[PDB]
Structures are given as C-alpha cells and as structure tokens.
Amino acid sequence: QPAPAWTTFRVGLFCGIFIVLNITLVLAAVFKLETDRSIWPLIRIYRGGFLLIEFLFLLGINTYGWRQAGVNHVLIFELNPRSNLSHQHLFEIAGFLGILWCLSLLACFFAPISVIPTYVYPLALYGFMVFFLINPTKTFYYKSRFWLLKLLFRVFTAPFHKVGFADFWLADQLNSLSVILMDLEYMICFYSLELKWDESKGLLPNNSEESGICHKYTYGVRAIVQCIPAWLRFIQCLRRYRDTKRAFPHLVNAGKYSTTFFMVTFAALYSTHKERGHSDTMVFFYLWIVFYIISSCYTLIWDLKMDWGLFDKNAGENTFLREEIVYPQKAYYYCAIIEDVILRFAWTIQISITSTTLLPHSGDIIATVFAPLEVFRRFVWNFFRLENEHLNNCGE
Amino acid sequence: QPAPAWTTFRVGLFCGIFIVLNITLVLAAVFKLETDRSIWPLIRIYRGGFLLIEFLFLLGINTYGWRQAGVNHVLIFELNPRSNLSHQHLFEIAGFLGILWCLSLLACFFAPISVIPTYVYPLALYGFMVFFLINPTKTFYYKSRFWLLKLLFRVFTAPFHKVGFADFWLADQLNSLSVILMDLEYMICFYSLELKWDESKGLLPNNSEESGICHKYTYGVRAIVQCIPAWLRFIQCLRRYRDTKRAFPHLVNAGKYSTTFFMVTFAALYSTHKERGHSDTMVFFYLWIVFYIISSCYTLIWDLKMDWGLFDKNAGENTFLREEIVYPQKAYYYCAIIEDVILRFAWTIQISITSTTLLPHSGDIIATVFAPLEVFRRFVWNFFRLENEHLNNCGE
C-alpha cells in the first residue's frame, strides 16, 4: 500500500537537511579547521556513528529490493505481518540520526559558545542514540525497537537459546560492523586514561610515554574485542550442531569461523614479537600471510557456493549461476562476484591492522579508508543470501 | 488524486534545503556582512524575487484550501478538467526559486573570485528566471508556463480583448505586485545610468550629490510605472461596461480604481512643490488626505459588501456574514475582516511612500516592511472571493 505523503515528505526533508549539512561541514573542515591540531581522535570517535547511519540506509535499500523482486522475506524472518517497517521508515530514521551526527560534528568544529570546550557533544549524541534504542514509551516505532532489543538479548546469549534465522543474520551483520565495537572501546580508553577531564581546551599534542596506551594491546584489550563477533557466531553454530546433529554444514562452519580466531591470535603474537624484536619475528610474518590466505581462500569458497548458491551443476544457459534466478539481469550477479573477491581481502587486511598496530602512521588511515567498504560488501551479500534462502524454501 | 511519492520527496528536499540556506544566510548576514558598505541596493534588487517566491507559495496554500474546502476553481477559471496543477507543484516551484535566490544572495555576499567582482549574480538570477518562464521546450510543466505567458499577454493589452474571469483575476493579483515593477525599474536605472559597468567595487560613498539619481522622480516615469496596473484594470472595467451595457457595477468599480490616479498625482505634486519650496505647498497636502479617505473608504465597501457579499440583509442567524458559508470557524471570517480593514490603509501608505520619495531615511525601511503584507492580504482575499463566485454560479 502507498505510504501517506507525510512519511515521504519527512524522508525528503531529512535527506535535504543532511545533504546541505554535509556540504557545509566539508567547507568548514577545508577552510576553518586548522591542520596543526591532530583531528584523528575525532574521526576515530565519529566513525561508529557514520557506519551505523550508512548501514541503516543500506538496509532500507535491501528491503526495497526485496519487496520489488518478490522475495517473501516476512515469512523468512518470521515477522509480524500486520506491523512491519518498509524502506521509508528506515530512510527517515537514518536521516534523522545523520542530521544529529552532522550537528554534533559541526558544533565540535566551531564550538559556538560554552565553558567546557568540545568533549560533551560525542557523549551527548551517543547517549541520545542509546536512549532512542531503549526508550520505554510507546512512541517512535515501539514494536520494532522492542523486537530488536529482544533479538539482541537472544544473540548475545545465543549458546543457551535456540538459534533462528534473524539470530544468525544479525550475528553476521555484527561481524561486519565490528568497527563500531573497537571504536567504542577506544573511546572508553581515551575518556578514562588520557583526557585531562579536570582541565580546559581538550586535545593537545602527546609527547609523554604513557600516551598511546590505547593504541597498544596492553594484555588483551585489543584482540578480544576484534574476535568477539567471531566467538558469538562460532558458538551459535556449535549449538546449532548440538541440537540438530547434522554433520556437513554445521561442523564445516566452525572451521571457517575459527580461522579468524587463528589469524587474530597470530597477529597479536606478531605484535608482541615486534615488541620483543625476536630474530624469528620475520619468519612469523610468513605464517600470518599463510593464515591470511587460509583465511580468505576459505570464506571465499563459502561465499559463492554455500551462501549465494552459485556454480550449480544444472546451470544450463545461466553461465556460472544457478538454474533459477529471480533478479532480471545477470550483470549484477557478475559484478557482485567480481567485487566480493576484491573486497574480502581488504576486509581481512583491515581486521589485521586494526588490532595488530602495524603501519604506525598509515594504519589508522588504512582503517578509515576501508572501513566503509566491508559494509558495502555485506550490503551486496544480503541480496543474494536472502534470495538463495527463498529459493531453498521454495524447493522444499 | 494521490500524487507520486517522488513529488512529495522533492517538495521535502527543497523545503529542507531552503530552511538551512535561510538559516546560514541569516548567520552570515549578522556575522560576515560588514556594515560600512551601504546594503540597500541589495534589498531593492532582491525584494522582487522574494515577493515573487512568497506569492507563489501563498498561491499554493490558496489552491490547497480551495480543493479541500469545496471551492470548485476548475469550472470558474475554465481550466481543463483532466490536466490541473496541484498545490505540491506550486510548492516545488516556490522552493526551487527560493533555493536559487538564496544561493545568489549568498554569492553576492561572498563572491569568492571572478573577473567581474560581485555584480553578475543578480542579472544571472533574473535571467535564469526569465529563461525558465520563456523556455520553449516541452518540459517543466510545459502547460503552466505557456498558459501564464498567454494570460500575461492578454492582460497587458487589456482594452482590446474580451474579458473573462482569469483575465480580471490576474489583473487584480498584479494590482498587488507593483513593487516588482518598481524594483525592476530601479535595477534597470542603476545598471544603465549610474553604475560604472567597466569598473570594480560597487560601494562608492553615498554622501556625494551624484548618488541617488535613480531615487529621484523629476523625470516623472516612477509615478506612471506605479499606476500602470491601475490603468490596466481601469481600462479593462471600462471595456467591460462598454461590452455589457450595465452602468452600476462596472462603472462604480472603475471609479474605485480611478481614485488612485488622483492619489498618486497629488502625492507627486506635493513632492515637486516641496522640493521647490513653493509658498502654499501644504495646500497641496489638504486635498490629498481627502483623496486618502475617499479612496480607502471606497475600496473597503467594495471588499466587504460587493467582493465578498458580507453584511447581507437576508443573512438570518449568521449576523454580519452571508446566509450560507462553507468554512467552519467564524473566527476565520472575523479575523479576515479585521486584517483586511487594517491592511487596506497600509497598502495605500506604501504606494504613496514608494511613489513620492518622502521620508528619506525611513521610507525604504517602511516600504520593505509593508511589502510582504498586501500580498498576504490578497492571499486572504482569494478564499472568500472564489467562494462567493462559486455560490453565485451554483445559485445562477
């Protein structure tokens, strides 16, 4: 059914304010923001909000495509039929949050008037976001936030509860968005140990030895945060095997989800080896690279054959595809297959350097540049995973 | 007729961009625009565009009101029943012109760099508006622009063509937009006579005797371009009387529009005598105030009694209104009566102030404040005029 003009009008209003705010923010950054002050902490803090906004927009795009293409995704997610969110609500929420993020960033830039210089705005934005998430009144999409909160509870306690479709789906979407988790941990570390709260001005050049502790792994504060979603999904799959006792897919997935654990622990060992400067440290490079290959070359084989279900023996006229395809043009299929193999390697590299403390001056730049790319990889992955599930359900 | 969601999205986008541009323009004006330079030429240049944008938005509100309340404008305007322009398109055009106007004003405020320092943006904006109006392509509401141009041609040569509803309605609307003509004339004079076109800057001191040449009226075309709309409507009503052979309504109406001729000529005569310091100059004042009252107290009885059909003897239970009404709240009618009575005086005050060059310091300011009020008065007027026309058509 066509949505009322109020919803669409709100979507457009928020989109336009968002666009103009982005342009004026770029102009202010290029012109007003002096380069001498380091601005890396600001980006490291606001990257999480940007990623969340982008993910919400992209999810709106996927649900649009799902309704257009004929995928019966309400039954697949086992949603409530009479109360569902279409693309416009997701667009409106994303635009609203983007307006707030842009306003907070602009305030941090200019600092119009206050006595505490700039370190209230990020806390305020994140506090309002979490308040929106857990607001107990019956307004602003109460059902959807209730369902999401219950499902988050189920996912983070998954080794105990039964696992369903939306459980592991949001488990993966958390696996791609781990950047927000490490950003939150770094923000807590910075606000706890580094910043002079009982002072003025704020950020200043760091010359002391104690500076840069949050850049270090200390004991495990960096690697464990990285592998947390891997642990969640690993334990979910183990439990699914335990209830089901079906060998092939459930036991195979454990290895795929444990390869990242092996890669992360090897990266941490290499970090401590550069700290020690051992003679064999260079040799430890090779193993990492090996387990880099063994990582990517694993999940790739899983992506095309098991996730998306390509390379069917009954391909027929559909070259390098399955017998039955719902999307009209094979061009998107081939484009996605091409770009996924490119983006997976960058994702693994990003995970490695965001916890290994490598490339000291360019590592965070690397993290920034390929942070909003695995999200697009997952945005592509969603379409084909859900359509494969729809045809699998249709077959049986 | 549910419009497509894209139209509503564009309306929202343009509204949001317009709001943010207005806010940043206000901020830049209070902060960045230094006050040493005389700025009144900028206001006298951009006032025409502002008034046109405002009039277009208010017409959108008017047509939405007619459609919702039951005022059947399609039959009376003689528009094609199957091709009509809804209020959302009027909102779109108003927002588009407003965004362009805001961008041009901001550029004139800043003017990053060029070969021509700052005075290309006004001609650029007005030329864009004209090329939009007279574009011969079959795009951008290819019926509305052509219909408006044809009606403008019919109105501007009124004493020759037959007179229908749309002709006199647009003539009445034009009666409230003489400020556009005054602004256009002043801009032409400034860019033709005084401005050093082959030069730079544009902030020459105003204390020189050479300044304010276009503010003078000794040549006497200011008054004529002022009363041009009055002449158009007067000769139109005279032609209507000639064609109809009915003295009462058309002839009294013609006298009504005739009074402003005496208004303007007496105002100009006082101005000339006062500059010459003629002994009995205040004598020329006296008749003026008389021709003040006999003007306003004239048009009022046309607006309240004949235009709207109020104060009817056969009203019945609805005291001080007509017998039948369509709008629910009498507070609307009473507030409209009070506001019409209040603003009918300010309209003639503004006319005399603009065409007489009195109050050398406060005249421009008071004209600026009273300009966006008689257009709102006309906006209020259309409601009840079209409702009375619909009642007349239904009854007979």
Alpha carbons A183 and A203: distance in angstroms, whole number: 17
- CB nearest B13 (choices: A2, A16, A24): A16
B126: Cβ–Cβ under 8 A, 6 or more apart, which residues? B49
* Residue whose C-alpha is closest to residue A391's, from A285, A279, A284, A314: A314
Question: Exposed/middle/buried for A126, CB within 10 Å: 0-12, 13-18, 19+?
Answer: middle
CB B264 within 8 A of CB B351: yes
Alpha helices in chain B (DSSP H): 5-31, 40-69, 73-77, 87-110, 121-133, 144-156, 165-175, 178-189, 221-244, 247-276, 281-301, 330-356, 362-395
Q: How many residues does chain A have?
A: 396
- A208-228 in b/e burial notation, b at 16+ Cβ within 10 A? eeeeeebeebeeeebbebbbb
Alpha carbons A135 and A139: distance in angstroms, whole number: 9
For residue B2, give the chain A residue with the closest CA: A5
Q: How many CB atoms lie within 10 A of CB B360?
A: 9
Max Cα–Cα distance, chain A, nearest Å: 71
* Residue whose C-alpha is closest to residue A386's, from A31, A149, A75: A75
Phi, psi torsion values for A230, nearest 5 degrees? -60, -45
Alpha carbons A30 and A32: distance in angstroms, whole number: 6
Alpha carbons B323 and B329: distance in angstroms, whole number: 15
For residue B24, give the chain A residue with the closest CA: A24
The two structure tokens encoding residue A76: 């697949």
Alpha carbons A353 and B94: distance in angstroms, whole number: 52
Phi, psi torsion values for B78, nearest 5 degrees? 55, 60
CB B21 within 8 A of CB B102: yes
Alpha carbons A146 and A152: distance in angstroms, whole number: 10
* Chain A contact present for B102, CB below 8 A: no
- Interchain CB distance below 8 Å, B17 and A19: yes
Rounded to whole angstroms, what are the CA distances from B355 to A229, A239, B329?
A: 76, 88, 39
CB A370 within 8 A of CB A346: yes
Alpha carbons A117 and A30: distance in angstroms, whole number: 21
For residue B6, give the chain A residue with the closest CA: A8
Identify the sign of the CA torsion A135, A140, A141, A142. positive
A155: Cβ–Cβ under 8 A, 6 or more apart, which residues? A167, A170, A171, A174, A232, A236
* Residue whose C-alpha is closest to residue B121's, from B96, B101, B104, B106: B104
State which approach was used to obtain the coordinates. Answer: cryo-EM
* Chain A contact present for B8, CB below 8 A: yes
For chain B, the C-alpha Rg in angstroms (whole number) is: 23
In the block, which residue shows the tokens 């990623």? A51
Please give, rounded to a whole number of angstroms, the shortest distance from the CA of A11 to a CA of chain B. 7
B252: Cβ–Cβ under 8 A, 6 or more apart, which residues? B302
* Surface of B (23-62) touching A: CB under 8 A: 24
CB B305 within 8 A of CB B321: no
B3 CB neighbours in chain A (<8 A) are 5
B118: Cβ–Cβ under 8 A, 6 or more apart, which residues? B108, B111, B202
* Residue whose C-alpha is closest to residue B351's, from B237, B182, B206: B182
Q: Is A310 left (phi over 0), alpha (psi -120 to 50) or beta?
A: beta
* Residue whose C-alpha is closest to residue A292's, from A314, A266, A324, A313: A266
Alpha carbons A47 and A192: distance in angstroms, whole number: 19
**Which amino acid appears at position B161 of this protein?**
H
Resolution in A: 3.6
Identify the sign of the CA torsion B308, B313, B315, B317. positive
In the block, which residue shows the tokens 């009694």? B305
* Chain A contact present for B5, CB below 8 A: yes
- Interchain CB distance below 8 Å, A8 and B10: no
The two structure tokens encoding residue B149: 């141009």
CA A14, distance to chain mean position in Å, is 23
- Interchain CB distance below 8 Å, B8 and A8: yes
The two structure tokens encoding residue A186: 């770094």
Alpha carbons A167 and B121: distance in angstroms, whole number: 58
The two structure tokens encoding residue A99: 């307006």
The two structure tokens encoding residue B79: 């528009």
Alpha carbons B309 and B323: distance in angstroms, whole number: 10
Alpha carbons B327 and B384: distance in angstroms, whole number: 10
Question: Exposed/middle/buried for B92, CB within 10 Å: 0-12, 13-18, 19+?
Answer: buried
- Interchain CB distance below 8 Å, A2 and B3: no
Alpha carbons A172 and B156: distance in angstroms, whole number: 69
Alpha carbons A144 and B155: distance in angstroms, whole number: 58
CA B125, distance to chain mean position in Å, is 19
* Residue whose C-alpha is closest to residue B126's, from B191, B175, B173: B191
* Residue whose C-alpha is closest to residue A102's, from A125, A118, A85, A86: A125
CB A102 within 8 A of CB A25: yes
Give the DSSP letter of residue A220: T
CB B339 within 8 A of CB B375: no
CB A60 within 8 A of CB A379: no
Q: How many CB atoms lie within 10 A of CB A59?
A: 19
Alpha carbons A180 and B356: distance in angstroms, whole number: 68
- Interchain CB distance below 8 Å, B5 and A2: yes
B86: Cβ–Cβ under 8 A, 6 or more apart, which residues? B1, B3, B63, B67
Identify the sign of the CA torsion B265, B270, B274, B280. positive
CB B379 within 8 A of CB B254: no
For residue B9, give the chain A residue with the closest CA: A12
Alpha helices in chain A (DSSP H): 5-31, 40-69, 73-77, 87-110, 121-133, 142-156, 165-176, 178-189, 223-244, 247-276, 281-302, 330-356, 363-395
Known binding residue B378? Answer is yes
In the block, which residue shows the tokens 């359900």? A393
Alpha carbons B222 and B277: distance in angstroms, whole number: 21
* Residue whose C-alpha is closest to residue B223's, from B254, B192, B181, B195: B181
CB A134 within 8 A of CB A116: no
Rounded to 10°, the helix B165-175/B221-244 angle is 160
